[PDB]
Design a protein around this nucleic acid. Structure first.
Ligand code: MG
Ligand code: MG
Ligand code: MG
Ligand code: MG
Ligand code: MG
Ligand code: MG
Ligand code: MG
Ligand code: MG
Ligand code: MG
Ligand code: MG
Ligand code: MG
Ligand code: MG
Ligand code: MG
Ligand code: MG
Ligand code: MG
Ligand code: MG
Ligand code: MG
Ligand code: MG
Ligand code: MG
Ligand code: MG
Ligand code: MG
Ligand code: MG
Ligand code: MG
Ligand code: MG
Ligand code: MG
Ligand code: MG
Ligand code: MG
Ligand code: MG
Ligand code: MG
Ligand code: MG
Ligand code: MG
Ligand code: MG
Ligand code: MG
Ligand code: MG
Ligand code: MG
Ligand code: MG
Ligand code: MG
Ligand code: MG
Ligand code: MG
Ligand code: MG
Ligand code: MG
Ligand code: MG
Lengths: 155, 68, 97, 114
RNA sequence: UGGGAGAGGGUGGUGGAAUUCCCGGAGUAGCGGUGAAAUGCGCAGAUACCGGGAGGAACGCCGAUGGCGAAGGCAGCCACCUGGUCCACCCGUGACGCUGAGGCGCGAAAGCGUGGGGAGCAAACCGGAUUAGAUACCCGGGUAGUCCACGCCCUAAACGAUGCGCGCUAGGUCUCUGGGUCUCCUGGGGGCCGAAGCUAACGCGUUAAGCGCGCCGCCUGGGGAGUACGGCCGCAAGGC
């Protein structure tokens, strides 16, 4: 907003890993303030990502986050009579959000029936660079790459 | 670094004095402003008029490519 | 669609349809005239034709007043036209620099 | 095949064309915003000049080109960037001389220029 | 009489930069153009690059809040012909002065006649875009014309919207050009800011729009109308 830069809310680390990141990701699973259900689904997912690929939920999820962090993105800026799509680096704060948002969103595009599974599977796939959340990442990054021409038009 | 200074008695009407004259051209060949020659109005005019004659004679250039 | 409100007055379907006919002048500009509203009323000094119309590039909001109702309806349309045209071409005004 | 040569940079507000020539002046290769893949106004940009000068120097090297003299004509937005790219190309750049053409008040310009 | 400055005017010469086209070379897939585009140009070899040539037009830097002219206006360089003007000396004439209805001359551009000339530019015109439309603005083309000689036209925001000459009424700062005893003083120009005073105000203010004399031109509500009629001028357009 207009006066000063707003401030990032510090999140309260999650009680099953103390991780500021799981909390964020939990929240983005949360519909309607039903955070209990949110954590459940998530934890259930981890249960699964342990079951199906015998290694650390936390370690896996953190990768899928690292692989969905878009580094460059496009931001529109009308110059003259064209709205040019300009290439911009994404500040880590936003990298995070987009990564978490997309992660959930791809997950909720999956055909597996139950929410808890889908989160698991998308997390699995994205640690390996597969999956929609990684697709969204690259679509974005190819887009910025094409428009490398308009980089000097940046703010 | 005013040019009028870096020279002794000299002739402004002397169009063959290529060695004096060429110092009043920018490195691009242009006749230099009063801010860089340090001439008055009156003198600066004769300067210009004789540099111009000189280029006609072959002695001074009309333009020079700028190097970096 | 087309909505006319006749306030503290009785008006005919004839008159109603005439308003639709006049307002049509706006179709010239070829942009969506969304849920336009014509309001007709009678002050002591003459009639009033108010109108509020939303288009893809903004809202037309204007008002005509005249001893003659038909003339007031026209004066309304003028103002509506002018505004609509300002909406449609204001964007072009700065293609250089 | 020739060792030393020339690189001319034609930089206009619309485009950058770079042609590499032999010592006597005859072209060996050339490139431009268009050749590198852009159409329209994008051709006029600094990123356009970059790809252009590279592709021009890249093509020159495979003919043995190694040292070039740089001649610059224009005041386009692709100009200074075009030079960057030639240096960073793998070519020597013994010089950089600007020979932009300007009249000593000659022909009447088009109206856009008055 | 001696000096000065200046794109003042006329004639003749003459230099380099750029654009365009032609010729040769080398080279390939685009160039160009816009807000973005398209038309256009380009594999029948364009663009970009080198060398040669042809031609017309304008003279970059110097260049200025500069200079010159009565005004219009005047800018590469050279010479010739020629005007205006300022200074210094205080030598000559002895009021020979001021203005000026008519008259006469000059008068940007566009336009016009005859003949040249024609690179760039560009009314008209063609086409592309923009746009609701776009007889425009923007883009690609393009003929008069722009240029020269000679003869016309005689307009203008031809403006300082300020007629000319003279005398008188504080100064401050910048500047151009003379002469000085050259710190500084004294002329003649060009700007700014300001005493008094003016002025409806805005502003003017030794470059008066101040205080005064002389002469000239002009105004007398807006439109109709710079129109009509008449007359004079013009080849016409049109002018008075
Ligand atoms: Mg997605
Ligand atoms: Mg109202
Ligand atoms: Mg372009
Ligand atoms: Mg050829
Ligand atoms: Mg050539
Ligand atoms: Mg002046
Ligand atoms: Mg005497
Ligand atoms: Mg007189
Ligand atoms: Mg008279
Ligand atoms: Mg005339
Ligand atoms: Mg003429
Ligand atoms: Mg004419
Ligand atoms: Mg005619
Ligand atoms: Mg003629
Ligand atoms: Mg003719
Ligand atoms: Mg047309
Ligand atoms: Mg059309
Ligand atoms: Mg047109
Ligand atoms: Mg045109
Ligand atoms: Mg043209
Ligand atoms: Mg032609
Ligand atoms: Mg004719
Ligand atoms: Mg004036
Ligand atoms: Mg005057
Ligand atoms: Mg008058
Ligand atoms: Mg008046
Ligand atoms: Mg008079
Ligand atoms: Mg008077
Ligand atoms: Mg003096
Ligand atoms: Mg002196
Ligand atoms: Mg004068
Ligand atoms: Mg003075
Ligand atoms: Mg003043
Ligand atoms: Mg006072
Ligand atoms: Mg004074
Ligand atoms: Mg008065
Ligand atoms: Mg009257
Ligand atoms: Mg009357
Ligand atoms: Mg008449
Ligand atoms: Mg008239
Ligand atoms: Mg008559
Ligand atoms: Mg008159």
């Amino acid at each position: 907003a207009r006066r000063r830069r707003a401030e990032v809310r510090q999140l309260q680390p999650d009680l099953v890993y103390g991780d500021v990141l799981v909390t964020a990701f939990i929240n983005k699973i949360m519909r309607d303030g039903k955070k209990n259900l949110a954590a459940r689904i998530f934890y259930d997912a981890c249960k699964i990502i342990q079951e199906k690929t015998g290694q650390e939920p936390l370690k896996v999820f953190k990768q899928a986050v690292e692989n969905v962090k878009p580094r460059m993105e496009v931001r529109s800026r009308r110059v003259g009579g064209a709205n040019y799509q300009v290439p911009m680096e994404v500040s880590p704060r936003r990298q995070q959000s987009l990564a978490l948002r997309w992660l959930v969103q791809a997950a909720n595009q999956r055909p597996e029936r139950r929410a808890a599974v889908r989160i698991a599977h998308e997390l699995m796939d994205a640690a390996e660079g597969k999956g929609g959340a990684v697709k969204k990442k690259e679509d974005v990054e190819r887009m910025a790459e094409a428009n490398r021409a308009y980089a000097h038009y940046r703010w | 670094a005013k040019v009028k200074a870096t020279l002794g008695e000299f002739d402004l009407r002397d169009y063959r004095n290529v060695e004096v004259l060429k110092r009043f051209l920018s490195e691009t060949g242009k006749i230099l402003p009063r801010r860089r020659t340090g001439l008055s109005a009156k003198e600066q005019r004769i300067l210009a008029k004789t540099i111009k004659r000189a280029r006609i004679l072959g002695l001074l250039p009309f333009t020079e490519k700028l190097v970096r | 669609t087309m909505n006319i409100t006749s306030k503290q007055m009785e008006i005919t379907p004839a008159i109603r349809q005439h308003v639709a006919d006049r307002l049509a002048k706006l179709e010239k500009w070829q942009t969506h005239l969304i849920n336009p509203h014509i309001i007709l009323s009678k002050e002591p000094q003459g009639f009033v034709a108010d109108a509020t119309i939303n288009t893809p590039n903004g809202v037309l909001v204007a008002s005509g007043k005249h001893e003659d109702m038909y003339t007031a309806i026209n004066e309304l349309i003028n103002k509506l036209e002018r505004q609509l045209n300002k909406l449609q071409h204001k964007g072009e005004a700065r293609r250089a620099a | 095949q020739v060792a030393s040569g020339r690189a001319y940079i034609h930089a206009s507000y619309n485009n950058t064309i770079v042609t590499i020539t032999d010592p006597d002046g005859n072209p060996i290769t050339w490139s431009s915003g268009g050749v590198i893949g852009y159409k329209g106004s994008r051709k006029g940009t600094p990123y356009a000049a970059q790809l252009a000068a590279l592709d021009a120097a890249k093509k020159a090297m495979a003919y043995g080109m190694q040292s070039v003299d740089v001649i610059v004509r224009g005041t386009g937005a692709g100009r200074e960037q075009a030079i960057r790219a030639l240096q960073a190309s793998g070519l020597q750049v013994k010089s950089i001389v600007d020979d932009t053409p300007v009249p000593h008040n000659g022909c009447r310009p088009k109206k856009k220029f008055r």
